[PDB]
Structure 1
């Protein structure tokens, strides 16, 4: 009984959720905007929301419930902290070098080539929005889990048949 309280995140979710207690990507975009997790920056774009839904969609419903929303909140905060470290000018954007450190402090060791190829895919006039940073974190997590589960020899090299490579990457 004692030590219970109203979850402060519940309100944002109930404002957008259907009577079934579920939200889809569009509904997720709205309540994330409301939640202030993107701060003063722009809303997450709809591809970023699709990625976030897919990340937590364990019943393959195309939707999430409130418990998953709270899980998502925890994940997004972890990643946001690394971002606001190196968002030294409060831009809501990081440059490629800043990005490299954020991902580094998260424990990704990526080469300058891997970072540059991430930056160029999501740059907007040479800088990466918080929105695109989050999309990138979601994809990195999924593709890294895909790589790791196939590393039989445990030397950081995976033997990828073509068909498996395609399904694996196209599924994200």
Structure 2
């Protein structure tokens, strides 16, 4: 009945063109936040939404089909639960001391230099990151690790790319 309620959710969200645009994604993400007032956030803007659709748009149709959206939707569902349980002091945000546990639960084993870089890019002055920033960060992190492994075909720990490839990977995100 889960695959069923989901297909129904997707049919209604995707609409006439059978795909979830950045605007449709933004709308549903903002309803999630409104239905969960314990999650602090300034909302998901169109810029963050386009960016998420882009790193998830594997077949480059510019929008999210059933499979692409499912993969993303299921990740956001997991990450939202992680955000809630790792927010130990109940501030509605994820602080620098809470971050490592959160990402580890998400399945990401990062070092201190990466964490500092993350906090500096996504967290605020106090070292706290809100809901949409947390989700936006994880969606991208997941996409980047996956892209790396995709290119690391010989499993040497290094990937080699030309300028066209580099631009596609960095600009379409």
Query: 1:88: which partner in 2?
Result: 88
Query: 1:139: which partner in 2?
Result: 140
Matches within 5 A, 1:128-167: 128-151=129-152, 154=155, 156=157, 158-160=158-160, 163=163, 164-165=165-166, 167=168
Question: Equivalents in 2 of 1:153, 1:6: separation in Å?
Answer: 40
The structure whose residues are more often helix, as a share, is 2
Query: 1:117: which partner in 2?
Result: 117
Asked if 2 retains the 8 angstrom alpha-carbon contact of 1:23 and 1:63, the reply is yes
Aligned residues, how many? 168
TM-score (ref. length: structure 1): 0.77
Residue deviations 1:69-110, cap 9 Å, x none? 444321111122222221113323111221111112223221
Asked if 2 retains the 8 angstrom alpha-carbon contact of 1:93 and 1:130, the reply is yes
Unaligned runs of 5+ in 2: none
CA gap 1:130/1:98 in 2 versus in 1, 3 angstroms: same
The structure whose Rg is larger is 1
Query: 2:62: which partner in 1?
Result: 62
Query: 2:73: which partner in 1?
Result: 73
Query: 2:98: which partner in 1?
Result: 98
Question: Equivalents in 1 of 2:33, 2:128: separation in Å?
Answer: 22
Query: 1:21: which partner in 2?
Result: 18
- 4+ runs of 1 displaced by more than 6 Å? none
Deviation at 1:13, TM superposition (A): 6.3
Question: Equivalents in 2 of 1:19, 1:118: separation in Å?
Answer: 38
Query: 1:30: which partner in 2?
Result: 27
Asked if 1 retains the 8 angstrom alpha-carbon contact of 2:52 and 2:140, the reply is no
Deviates more, 1:91-100 or 1:29-38: 29-38
